[PDB]
Design a protein around this ligand. Structure first.
Ligand SMILES: [Cl-]
Length: 162
């Protein structure tokens, strides 16, 4: 297991524009296109991201390339954020994957607001962090995915994904 396999499981793969769990236009392996309700706006974002006129459809190679860029952007967002970087650097490799997963799903600013969870993670209070992470809109709106991510923080293993 690695971060790419973990997020591929959590996000799936769809080659045509779809709506994510929040109702936002998305493509590929969970690549958000826009929060605008305009499908044309989503199609313009797609063409810009891919570099060609796609008509709302991409290839699997294109989906995987977008996915690699998106994972890297999540990592670089963590490393440039004064609240997230110290927690990230305190974690082992498996738990770092759980952190990237959260930033991929909710964005750097969203995860940076989990101030008390982040402190408990940095203190390595895993069960306490797990309880605190579940007290969130995130857990309530996507409970199966949040439970997998939280189990990864709690145990430091890939057991939720096996
Ligand atoms: Cl879910």
């Amino acid at each position: 297991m690695n971060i790419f396999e973990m997020l591929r499981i959590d996000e799936g793969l769809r080659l045509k524009i779809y709506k994510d769990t929040e109702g936002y236009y998305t493509i590929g392996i969970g690549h958000l296109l826009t929060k605008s309700p305009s499908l044309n706006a989503a199609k313009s974002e797609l063409d810009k991201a891919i570099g060609r006129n796609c008509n709302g459809v991409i290839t699997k190679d294109e989906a995987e390339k977008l996915f690699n860029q998106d994972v890297d952007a999540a990592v670089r967002g963590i490393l440039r954020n004064a609240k997230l970087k110290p927690v990230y650097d305190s974690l082992d490799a498996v738990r770092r994957c759980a952190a990237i997963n959260m930033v991929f799903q909710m964005g750097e600013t969203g995860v940076a607001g989990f101030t008390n969870s982040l402190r408990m993670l940095q203190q390595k209070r895993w069960d306490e962090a797990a309880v605190n992470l579940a007290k969130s809109r995130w857990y309530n709106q996507t409970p199966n995915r949040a439970k997998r991510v939280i189990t990864t923080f709690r145990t430091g293993t890939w057991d939720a994904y096996k």
